[PDB]
Amino acid sequence: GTCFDADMDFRASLKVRKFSGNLSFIKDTKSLEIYILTTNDEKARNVDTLSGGEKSFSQMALLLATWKPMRSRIIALDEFDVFMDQVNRKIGTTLIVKKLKDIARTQTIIITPQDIGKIADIDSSGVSIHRMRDP
Amino acid sequence: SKDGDPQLEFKVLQGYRDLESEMHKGRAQVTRTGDIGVAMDNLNAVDSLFNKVIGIKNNGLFAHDARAMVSISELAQISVRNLKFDDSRSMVNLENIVNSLKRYMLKEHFKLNNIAENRNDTSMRHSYLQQFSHYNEFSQFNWFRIGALYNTISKNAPITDHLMGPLSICFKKLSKKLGPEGSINLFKFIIDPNSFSRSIENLFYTSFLIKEGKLLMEHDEEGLPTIKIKQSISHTDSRSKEIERQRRRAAHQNHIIFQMDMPTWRKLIKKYNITSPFLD
Amino acid sequence: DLTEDLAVAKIVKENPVARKMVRYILSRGESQNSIITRNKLQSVIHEAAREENIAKPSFSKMFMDINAILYNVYGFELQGLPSKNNMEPLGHRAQKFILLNNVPHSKNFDDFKILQSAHTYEELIVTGEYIGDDIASGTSNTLESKLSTDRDLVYKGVLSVILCIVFFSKNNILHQELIKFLETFGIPSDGSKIAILNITIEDLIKSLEKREYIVRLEEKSDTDGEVISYRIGRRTQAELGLESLEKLVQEIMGLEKEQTKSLHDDIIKSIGDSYSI
Amino acid sequence: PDLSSFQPGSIIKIRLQDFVTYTLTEFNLSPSLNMIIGPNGSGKSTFVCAVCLGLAGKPEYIGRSKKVE
Amino acid sequence: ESPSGYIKKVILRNFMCHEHFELELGSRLNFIVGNNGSGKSAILTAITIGLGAKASETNRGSSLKDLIREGCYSAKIILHLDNSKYGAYQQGIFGNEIIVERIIKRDGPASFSLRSENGKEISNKKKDIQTVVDYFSVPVSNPMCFLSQDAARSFLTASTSQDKYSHFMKGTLLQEITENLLYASAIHDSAQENMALHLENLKSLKAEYEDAK
Amino acid sequence: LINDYQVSESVVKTLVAQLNIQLDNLCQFLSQERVEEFARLKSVKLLVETIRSIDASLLDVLDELRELQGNEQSLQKDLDFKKAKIVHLRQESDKLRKS
Amino acid sequence: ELRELEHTVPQQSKDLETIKAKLKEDHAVLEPKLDDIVSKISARFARLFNNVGSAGAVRLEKPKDYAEWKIEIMVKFRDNAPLKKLDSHTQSGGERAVSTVLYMIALQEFTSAPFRVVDEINQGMDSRNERIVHKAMVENACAENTSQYFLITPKLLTGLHYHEKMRIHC
Amino acid sequence: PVTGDATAKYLLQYILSARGICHENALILALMRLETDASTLNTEWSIQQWVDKLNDYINAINVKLNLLGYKIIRINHGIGRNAVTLKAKQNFEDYAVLQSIVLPESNRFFVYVNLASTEETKLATRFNQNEIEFMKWAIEQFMISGETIVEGPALETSIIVKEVNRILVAATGDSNLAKWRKFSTFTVGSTNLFQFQELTATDIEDLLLRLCELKWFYRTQEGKFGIDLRCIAELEEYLTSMYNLNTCQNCHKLAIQGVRCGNESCREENEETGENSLSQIWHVDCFKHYITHVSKNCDRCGSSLITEGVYVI
């Protein structure tokens, strides 16, 4: 059931970036193979042959699919790593916002060192941004 | 969603949370009275709870179930050996010996957890040893007792420490010799005749001086950096210089992307009237 | 007391080499709680005789004088270790000697000192810690405490528990048996250093068998491979007397003193063939 | 210069053309010590990318760029 | 519609990051923009402490003394959650908002406080606060319930098959249930060999029982 | 252009690996992300990295002794089985008295 | 079948004893090389911490099983804090980066590769530690036939210690 | 010999089981237990005769040890009168043998020591020659770092400053110039002792741990390594013959803690180090006895109490 839920959440998250993917969980060798479709490939390939931004996107999608089966009301995330590119980090942030503002059964407390109030819109409902005094 | 209504999960969570406490508080009575029927009722209740869980996934109670079953199994397998081998004759084997040798509970429960275990339940002198087989680690038994008991009352060995017998038997020197009041431009070290590879020496070291925090230097309209020989504090402590560098770095720093291969570079030597390189 | 003390002053003033050798024996026996052999004794006494250009005296009289001095000044006595191949203690014939007092033990000082040691232990390892650089306060030993090592005391405790384990093991314990015993006690044998002993179990047992506290037995066969047994050393037999082990087991049991009877025979039958007497 | 002064696998001359932003790189390397002390963004990242791509390594390992182009 | 139990206001009293803090958090999403010298966040540690999560799982402080602000003796943390929407926990007596408060002093164990909407104290035992934080399906024993900086920076650099599979197995409770199952199998083998020894002893006692019939 | 002979990427890889300098080796090239990764590395992988940096013969002998340790552990289980077989031999002596 | 087992046990027993003998001989011949390696790296560790002034130690853990052979790094940066393992809980990222770069420069003479490449060390840290590390590397590089070292610093500082072997370049 | 020599050997064994060093109260209660183990119980006995007979027995055994070569030297303590016992849990154990076990004045200790300097009999107690030289170098660094040239106004507060301030306000309560900006710290080299050449770090660090837990080195609340009372009682003349160290107004008392000012009128300049290197040094107890008696002014050619009060760490 958890594998099915992770697969459906993965495909739902990848449909935002007009991509198609699936999961393949095997317990014989304890390895997880992920197939991701590129922009123009007509075939889903492994994430090892993908770019850094696509790898970060797949990692974020896997994290979302692993966290989705939980029913926790309040969660928190602070000091996210910046190994990914800014052009991909922006798309990942918009994807996170669009996925977390649709459902109201879960409340998230995101802590980002960079500015989000300037690059992202404010009129979008379900988004609350706050700042403190710079030390 | 009726499938997995939170009241069922809350109820089973509270049931596990107080059942584990009941087991932890009744393991002593189970060991003393020797009646495993309490563990049987616990297993029956666990099976019933799991049957009510069947249909909805719940991974939180699995760890508690594993802990309960491992505790019951170890308690049974230890009480079977610690039980009297005969109906009347209480066989004092090596197990009873190691139990009576590891019966000290002065700190691991009396001081670490601030709990006082009960002491009420020839042949009956065997039910006070099964409740002392849950160490799972070495820093719980008071080895210090048997340590201090040795060489004092049992071995009476003279432990005396002997006294202390064997003990009782390149650019810095150039800037200094140039003078602190003397100021030299950054474009003076680059101009070198008969060599077209020495112009990449100083342009990477004197990039900016406002970060150094010496003084407020005037911003040039052309964009070339400026530098003035001034005294700098030097201390052995790392933090004393770190806080100073951090407070000096608080000033504004110009970030210009100017870069070029020195167009009309011969105009520098016209005013800098130098031919030999300053650096040796 | 003045008559006995003055008699020691006469035999000490007669030859300072006696004082020299008795203080050397005391230092060698108290520095690392080690043993002394006979040949070393003759070598050091000959060195002292050649240094102080005095003819070498007899052996029995010198041994008696050393015993009297160490018994009247510090209360100790140099006890000789009986031979293993031969087995009356050989006072002037044995090849191994050890210092040990011959005083009747008290019955309240042990309780007070163990109560004080427990009061300290309540503070030493709070939350699984250890005194020293970890503890903020520098006076970790409270400037006054009857432990004096904080390292060798738990070592002596482990030694005593090993002695009891081998005692109740019919004087014949297997290496795997003691390994699993230390495992169920809590001391791992996977090779990790002990947080308090700062040594492994194999180095500990090899230093113990080197300390002559335990004797190893090696046997070779076809189906058993390399079997190793452990025996009680003669030093333990000379140190731990019958009343000493009786008090030890009655303190370990922690029962009433009225049931002390009929237990001496049980202890004798459980220790097995451990004493040559 | 010397045989024992240069360890096996050492590079002496640096020649970068039409690759780095400066496009004209001639760096002098010494067997004693070589340091690059400058401000951020002056071209240190480009220099390390050039010297690691001279080995023809994987561009995704450093994470600076996706492809060689 | 959004269920109750969500955070509304956050305040920190005598804390290392912010000795005097005040902020409002929405029900749908909460975004915080700022910089911190230390690796720990400004509100994550206080929220995890107030919700019942131990500092050992957060790996932020080695001891409880370092979490206290320097210059003060007690560290006060207050939490405010709304109960006006669906899924209220005794809204009649606890009002529209349930306030939980935890005080961490230098000496002795940490102090707690359970306040209603008016601010009156009801109880002090940890079982009550554990129940009120577990009723809203908020698990504090799961380290993935609150994503820290170290866990995030270690999971983001795990974009390979084996490490991804190990991280997925190390999810909320997958690693826990797998290790529980393997330990159950191991204790089953040990119990079965112990019962084989007991069966040998019972065969001896039955050979003796031929003298009891 | 090596010795006036056109090569490919694999030739450059083996040539640079033969000169004891590599990019995958964490003791020859470091960066911010690589330093942060090396700081959080376990001790066993740190030992593997060190033995890779010093001498591959250490890797060979280490894997050899590891597989031989696994083999001797399997043989320890085998000798436990043969001890069980000795107990079965005692049972067979009892059955021989029965016969 | 037990007589057949009696037939089959001698070769398995001699294989057991031969494997045990080869294990013990391999351990005996492997101990000296790892011992000298760890002693040399600990000597370099102590020398570099004497040069920088901080405190630290490195010890090799040798369990009974060789599969879990682990090496520990015990660094004590703070005077009040006792000896602590290298982790993110005891110290911040700066001390961890310092330990990593000193461990990298320690294994420089043992590695056969000539040049060491490191960069991005002064990110939010005091440049005094990096200056001390650079001056220690300079003092260690005064000898002949020394390994090449490439140092890249995000920032710079004036009033430091210079040598005749360094040259400013872009 | 049934009770006299018996109790003498008992007290000697009890004082040796504590690494030579033992509290006066500890020996007093030990002798209480000895005298209760006698034939009759002595209830009508006050503390003065008890400590008198205790000192008498200590002398009667010290003469014997001197006839053998050792000695039991009694010295005072640096920490003040009412602060040596207020450390933690004055009496560990109630279960008092007598109806009352109290002692207001307890500042004198006892340490096992000899008089021979060569000692050709002993070669190594628990450490070989390398560690012997290491300990010698550590003692040399501790001695050479006793004096300072400049101190900070930090006013570190662990043990002695509060005691000396309490003594000052008990004698003359002003609390105006007691916070002096100059100190005299003898305990130096916490992390400086880590700098060693021929050995590794783990061995020296755990050997230093074993030393400070073997009653040979003491630390402070901050963790400052120092030289405890055992060494200053054992190395009586070794700390004065090698390096000139001054004593108090008594016969011979090595002062490591107490009061020391030496502002400008230092002693003779035979050596390069000043700050009263020949005389004019008092302990905390000696300073309390001086300020509570006649001649409140110091004997160093005039020195007011305002400039005095310098802490000696």
Number of helices of chain A: 3
Say what oligomer this is. part of a larger assembly
Gap from first CA to last CA of chain D: 37 Å
Structural class estimated from helices and strands of chain D: alpha+beta
Sheet bearing the most strands of chain D, described?
2 strands, antiparallel
Main sheet of chain D: which strands, in order across? 1-2
Structural class of chain A: alpha+beta
* Total beta strands of chain A: 6
Distance between the termini of chain A: 47 Å
Descriptive account of the structure:
This is part of a larger assembly, with two copies of chain A, one copy of chain B (280 residues), one copy of chain C (277 residues), three copies of chain D and one copy of chain H (313 residues). Chain A is built from three helices and six strands. Chain A has helices spanning 2-14, 52-67, 86-102; strands at residues 21-26, 31-37, 44-46, 74-78, 107-112, 129-131. The longest helix of chain B has 28 residues, at 6-33. The radius of gyration of chain B is 41 Å and the shape is elongated. In chain D, 20% of the residues lie in helices and 20% in strands. In chain D, strands 1-2 form a two-stranded antiparallel sheet. In chain D, a hairpin with a 6-residue loop joins β1 (13-17) and β2 (24-28). Chain D starts with 12 loop residues before the first strand and ends in a 7-residue tail after the last helix. Chain H has 313 residues and is mainly alpha-helical. Chain H contains nine helices and six strands; from the N terminus they run αααββαααββααβαβ. A two-stranded antiparallel ribbon of chain H has the order 1-2. In chain H, strands 3-4 form a two-stranded antiparallel ribbon. In chain H, strands 5-6 form a two-stranded antiparallel ribbon. Chains in contact: A-D, A-E, B-C, B-D, B-E, B-G, B-H, C-G, C-H, D-F, D-G, E-F, E-G, F-G, G-H. Chains A and E meet through β2, α2, β4, α3 and β5 of A and β2, β3, α1, β7 and α5 of E. β4 (74-78) of chain A pairs parallel with β7 (146-147) of chain E.
